[PDB]
Amino acid sequence: MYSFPNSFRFGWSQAGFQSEMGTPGSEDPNTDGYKWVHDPENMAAGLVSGDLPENGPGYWGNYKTFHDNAQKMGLKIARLNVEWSRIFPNPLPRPQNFDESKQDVTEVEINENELKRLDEYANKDALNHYREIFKDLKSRGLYFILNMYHWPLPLWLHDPIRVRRGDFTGPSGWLSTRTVYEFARFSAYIAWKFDDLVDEYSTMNEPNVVGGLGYVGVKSGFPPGYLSFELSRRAMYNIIQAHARAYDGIKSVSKKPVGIIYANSSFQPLTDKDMEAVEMAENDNRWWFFDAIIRGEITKIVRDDLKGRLDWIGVNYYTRTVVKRTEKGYVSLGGYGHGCERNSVSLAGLPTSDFGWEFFPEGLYDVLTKYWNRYHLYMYVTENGIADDADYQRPYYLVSHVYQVHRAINSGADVRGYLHWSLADNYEWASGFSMRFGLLKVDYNTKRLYWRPSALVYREIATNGAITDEIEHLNSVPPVKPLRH
């Protein structure tokens, strides 16, 4: 048996755009993401799947059924976000004493009168509905992490088709400090409205994906799909200071912990001669960002308005990345990690998911202990899961990664919970509905939820607070011989 601290919580994470829509009256047509996935040219290009989020799993209407099943599964923590677009579907007045040309945003003043004026423009129907959802959540005894931002922006801040086309005269998302300013005020406003229900806050989810896929990895179908190293850097600079200004904003109205959730990989050497390549990749993908919002270090200078703006770190982990040293520096290798064939085996002989992602639970121990030793900030595993409609690999994936969290705690790392991605199947961005990450399988015609066997395994873990003796054999690699390869 592998037992966890009495205070450790098992639960799940979920995103609004991916799970809310699907029931009558639930559609949110007012985001950059909604425009992006409906765009005829994006569909013709195959940048998006043609599946549409308004045919989704229906959490907006059916949240009591989601929460019923989570409670029956023994879950004790959830991380959800509010959709900015639902709260402010129409534009806010452009800020007066605000200079859009100033590169740096070092303060965004929050006060009671500003909050009461913002309240005039908020959608009270959406606010009340979210209160009902979150009250129902809390009434099941679930600890609540509220995340402010999980990729879609109001269209009045970002028209992604205009930017895709190379037109930068309109609302340009994270390329504009207007978005930085409004995100800070949005985050303060939500904490002001919901602090009585929230246990901890996250400002954002996977900001590195926003900048990396939106402006470099443009085949991914992440908006606005405008290929530019320069603008990727500008977007990440703005998202960093937006995190800091939202941290300060929330702290002006709340005493509760404020963290951030990040897309992590475990960087692994192709050969024993590649350890410096690993360090370089960790610098280029992880430490540059966290040194900025924890130590204030940015490109070198120290900004005192960035330093110390983090209480905890959310680790989102799915697989590794294998790197080797080059003359110029380092490169990642296809055939491992997230660059494998779907439903196959990696070059290392490890099974791959429906998404082509390699089975590599030891990477989660690596990431947790690396963060702990560098910053000594406590952590949640805020995402971990697998695309696996058939449920062949998920029982092993679940138990093996939970075991690696147990290992990390035994080594001294302060890890306070494990949140699986996800409770139920949902809309997986440019891939649509075909990638199924749920413990629960969704029938999108009826919106009914079904328990995959891994959900029964998870109930055993969560209700016992342990990997029990009876399921310890699942701490192993899914047998590869019976799988496609």
Residues that bind its own copies (CB under 8 A): 343, 354, 388-392, 395, 441, 443, 448-451, 453-454, 456-457, 460, 469-473, 478-479, 481-485
Residue 354's binding partner among ligand 14O, its own copies, Cl ion, none (Cβ under 5 to 8 angstroms by kind) is its own copies
Residue 450's binding partner among ligand 14O, its own copies, Cl ion, none (Cβ under 5 to 8 angstroms by kind) is its own copies
DSSP state of 342: T
Residue keyed to tokens 């207007």: 178
Angle, helices 288-295/229-251, rounded to nearest 10 degrees: 30
Q: What are phi and psi of 262, to 5 degrees?
A: -135, 150
| Closer to its own copies by Cβ: residue 121 or 451 | 451
Q: Which of left, alpha, beta for 313 (phi over 0: left; psi -120 to 50: alpha)?
A: beta
Residue keyed to tokens 């360090």: 279
Q: Which of residues 206-225 bind ligand 14O (CB under 6 A)?
A: 221-223
Q: Is the peptide bond before 228 cis (omega within 30 degrees of 0)?
A: no
Q: Is the dihedral of CA 15, 18, 23, 25 positive or negative?
A: positive
| Closer to its own copies by Cβ: residue 212 or 478 | 478
Q: Which of 460, 378, 369, 364 is nearest to 410 (CA)?
A: 369
Residue 469 C-beta: closest distance to Cl ion, Å = 16
| Closer to ligand 14O by Cβ: residue 47 or 246 | 47
Residue 397 C-beta: closest distance to its own copies, Å = 12
How far, in Å, CA of 392 to CA of 454, rounded?
Answer: 9
Burial group, residue 196, by CB count within 10 angstroms (0-12, 13-18, 19+): exposed
Residue 37's binding partner among ligand 14O, Cl ion, its own copies, none (Cβ under 5 to 8 angstroms by kind) is ligand 14O
Residue 81 C-beta: closest distance to ligand 14O, Å = 12
Burial 131-147 (b: 16+ CB within 10 A, else e): eebbeebbeeebbbbbb
Q: Which candidate in 206, 282, 358, 428 is catalytic?
A: 206
| Closer to ligand 14O by Cβ: residue 17 or 63 | 17
Task: Count other Cβ atoms within 10 Å, centred on residue 276.
Answer: 13
Question: Is residue 426 near Cl ion by the rule CB under 5 A?
Answer: no
* Interface region with Cl ion, contact rule CB under 5 A, candidates 67-75, 132-140, 284-292, 453-461: 284-292
Stretch (H or E) spanning 159:
none
What single-letter amino acid sits at 249? G
DSSP line for 78-138 = EEEE--HHHH--SPPPPPTT--TT-S--------HHHHHHHHHHS-HHHHHHHHHHHHHHH
Question: Is residue 478 near ligand 14O by the rule CB under 6 A?
Answer: no
Question: Is residue 33 near ligand 14O by the rule CB under 6 A?
Answer: yes
Residue 443 C-beta: closest distance to Cl ion, Å = 5
Residue 444's binding partner among ligand 14O, its own copies, Cl ion, none (Cβ under 5 to 8 angstroms by kind) is Cl ion
Question: Is residue 48 near ligand 14O by the rule CB under 6 A?
Answer: yes
Sole binder of Cl ion in the list 69, 264, 316, 343 (CB under 5 A):
264
Question: Is residue 67 near Cl ion by the rule CB under 5 A?
Answer: no
Residue pair 344/484 in contact (Cβ under 8 Å)? The answer is: yes
| Closer to ligand 14O by Cβ: residue 89 or 223 | 223
Is residue 383 annotated as a catalytic residue, yes or no?
Answer: yes
Residue 288's binding partner among Cl ion, its own copies, ligand 14O, none (Cβ under 5 to 8 angstroms by kind) is none
Residue 223's binding partner among ligand 14O, Cl ion, its own copies, none (Cβ under 5 to 8 angstroms by kind) is ligand 14O
Is residue 470 annotated as a catalytic residue, yes or no?
Answer: no
* Interface region with Cl ion, contact rule CB under 5 A, candidates 238-246, 286-294, 382-390, 461-469: 286-294
Q: Residues interacting with ligand 14O, by CB under 6 A?
A: 33, 36-37, 48, 151-152, 221-223, 429-430
Q: Which residue numbers are catalytic?
A: 206, 383
